[PDB]
């Protein structure tokens, strides 16, 4: 996260770290959506241009974390993966369309003050809140600058951007399964996701029921925190039917 700040303790209890077993390193962010399901970006697991194709046994999920590198004894919980599910129409060839994946844990995780699931938005909450100018919140342990790495989880609040401005900021083909967020050059304020924040959540706190909803997944950007560029997020609600199909069938 570029131009963010340290998270408060328990501020993002759905935050998940995807951790590579060997070599031990941060792979991506993710989010906890129930006691046994974790949501992330497909490109965190499968990206052939970079020779990336992880299987279940390559990875662990670490939940309840705050420090990036410490083993947070008696706080974090580490889970193994039963199965990975990648969207069947995830477009790794072109533009990361449908950049979404689910991971089922081998055993349910116990909730605590530090470990708690986020809601996924219904049609009406999504319609009300996914509007240009409305702000969401992005969290992660990724890089602090495009060109270092944080001691603890970082957080930044960013406004959703009008779709024509998103489209006009890039040569990559945008789709309805994406939205973009960030400040414009004339707005003064700054902030963005960056390498390592992939797969983490873009959340909004509904003013109707005072609950947090995950509207987006950190997906792609061109550099980090560049003027006139914006971060792109998988549109979670648009992929609801696939999420529900996977969880209803497997779970």
């Amino acid at each position: 996260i570029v131009e963010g700040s340290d998270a408060e303790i328990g501020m993002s209890p759905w935050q998940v770290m995807l951790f590579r077993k060997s070599p031990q390193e941060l792979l991506c962010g993710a989010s906890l959506i129930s006691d046994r399901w974790v949501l992330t970006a497909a490109h965190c697991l499968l990206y052939p241009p970079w020779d990336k194709n992880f299987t279940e046994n390559d990875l662990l999920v670490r939940i309840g974390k705050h420090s990036r590198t410490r083993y947070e004894r008696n706080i974090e919980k580490i889970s193994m993966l039963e199965k990975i599910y990648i969207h069947p129409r995830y477009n790794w060839r072109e533009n990361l369309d449908r950049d979404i994946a689910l991971m089922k844990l081998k055993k349910p995780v116990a909730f605590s003050d530090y470990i708690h699931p986020v809601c996924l938005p219904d049609r009406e909450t999504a319609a009300s809140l996914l509007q240009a100018g409305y702000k969401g919140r992005v969290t992660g342990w990724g890089n602090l600058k495009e060109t270092g790495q944080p001691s603890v989880l970082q957080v930044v609040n960013l406004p959703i951007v009008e779709r024509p401005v998103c489209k006009d900021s890039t040569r990559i083909r945008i789709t309805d399964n994406m939205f973009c967020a960030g400040y414009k050059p004339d707005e003064g304020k700054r902030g963005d996701a960056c390498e390592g924040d992939s797969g983490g959540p873009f959340v909004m706190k509904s003013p109707f029921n005072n609950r947090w909803y995950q509207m987006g997944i950190v997906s792609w950007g061109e550099g980090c925190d560049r003027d006139g560029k914006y971060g792109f997020y998988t549109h979670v609600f648009r992929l609801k039917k696939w999420i529900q199909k996977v969880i209803d069938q497997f779970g």
Partner: peptide, 30 residues
């Protein structure tokens, strides 16, 4: 399961405490 209480943080909403920047989000929901 987590369904009933999803999105309500133990150290914030569950205790009626606010984090330091959630108000910035609310102010944008016009």
């Amino acid at each position: 399961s987590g369904e009933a209480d999803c999105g309500l943080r133990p150290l914030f909403e569950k205790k009626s405490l606010e984090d330091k920047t959630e108000r910035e989000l609310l102010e944008s929901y016009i």
